[PDB]
Design a protein around this ligand. Structure first.
Ligand SMILES: Nc1ncnc2c(CN3C[C@H](CSc4cnccn4)[C@@H](O)C3)c[nH]c12
Ligand SMILES: Nc1ncnc2c(CN3C[C@H](CSc4cnccn4)[C@@H](O)C3)c[nH]c12
Lengths: 230, 230
């Protein structure tokens, strides 16, 4: 009855999700994505990785809604930390997201702003509150804050400082804003969950390669614990 | 029978299109866009502006295909020139497009490249050849070349030089690559047509404000002349 879309960006972000749910899936190709459709605890779960970045994630989210009729979207994967209290493996949910690389300042628009839109995109308060409930019950830390998304891998102190000063972001990645954006356009509740893989600095490539697997698994496991209470 | 999607980014890019076709339209809202559906010369034409930038244009193109079933997409609007021979009001069609702001160089990927994708996206050779045919019949100039798209308005000599050296782009805008990308994923022929509004330099804001209306109309008129031969 209930249909839940579950997204990662990279194949590595959904491999643990498919394993952890542990049910059979049917593969359905559409728009260059493969959607894994299964039944888990009397819900239909549609799992896919978008591929990296904003165009890829916008397309896949739109397909999930328009073609598969999902009623909620939960995103799971990894992110770069922009704040000292978010360390490798730590979890956060995005309260709001921003497209940090949007620049129409030539027309005196604030950075991140596009006409007929807004700088910040909201996610589901209800899903975020569920996440918080669960993390307290499991005795694990969970931050809530702003996630910045853009089409560059961030690995420089200069760009971190910009994201912190301009948007007060807590983490950076490349898909969350686009997924939340599409969901809000269609009135679909959305939760964006990330586990820290790196510190978005000059060492980020190294850290990301080291921690992608573990951080993705941490996010996946948490996402499943959310689905278990929906 | 035949269904043709017609896109602009800004309302100003489609105002002349609706006027020039000169038929009645029904308005259908979906995903935060308004789609104008009409019949012209025994074709169904679905006209919309996406709103600015890559997420907006990806969403709208995806909706056109998945929700409205369009069989071809023609994009019309304005662009910044990166080459001396493309002057204000001149027309070009994109032979290929690139997302110029994509940077995964931290993992030794070439600029513009995303794993499981490609730097350059192709458009319909057939539609481009039609455009060329028509422009010769009308005795108007039409260039064919690479268009670079990203989520920044380009207005600096440094960024122009980069687009020319890195991608050999002839023009810059903020939507074309995303529209062509979605179309290719779904096997839908796509043509991206632009009229020059500015030179993508420090004076670009000024020039754009001056020439948006005329350049949009020039593009719209040409697009209609294409539809008249489909
Ligand atoms: N510092 C950071 N900046 C921007 N994004 C991130 C992320 C999250 N994901 C990982 C991946 C990096 S690109 C990639 C990965 N592997 C191969 C090629 N490209 C992209 O999907 C966004 C983690 N840390 C980040
Ligand atoms: N130099 C350039 N760089 C990048 N893009 C362009 C374009 C084409 N369009 C116009 C518009 C500019 S932003 C906008 C316009 N008006 C108000 C707010 N933002 C965006 O839709 C892309 C023309 N010249 C360009």
């Amino acid at each position: 009855v209930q249909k839940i879309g579950i997204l990662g960006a990279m194949r590595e972000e959904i491999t643990p999700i498919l394993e952890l749910f542990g049910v059979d899936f049917e593969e359905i190709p559409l728009g260059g994505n493969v959607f894994h459709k299964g039944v888990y605890h009397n819900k239909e779960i549609i799992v896919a990785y978008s591929k990296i970045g904003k165009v890829h994630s916008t397309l896949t989210t739109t397909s999930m809604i328009l073609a598969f009729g999902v009623q909620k979207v939960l995103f799971s994967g990894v992110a770069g930390s922009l704040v000292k209290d978010l360390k490798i493996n730590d979890l956060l949910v995005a309260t709001q997201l921003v497209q940090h690389d949007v620049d129409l300042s030539a027309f005196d628009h604030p950075l991140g702003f596009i006409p007929e839109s807004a700088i910040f995109i909201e996610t589901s308060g209800s899903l975020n509150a569920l996440a918080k409930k669960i993390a307290n019950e499991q005795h694990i830390a969970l931050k809530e804050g702003v996630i910045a998304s853009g089409d560059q891998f961030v690995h420089s102190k200069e760009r971190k400082e910009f994201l912190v000063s301009e948007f007060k972001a807590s983490a950076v990645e490349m898909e969350g804003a686009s997924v939340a954006f599409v969901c809000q356009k269609f009135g679909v509740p959305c939760c964006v969950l990330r586990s820290i893989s790196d510190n978005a600095d000059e060492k980020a490539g190294m850290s990301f390669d080291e921690f992608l697997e573990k951080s993705a698994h941490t996010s996946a496991k948490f996402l499943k614990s959310m689905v278990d209470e929906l």
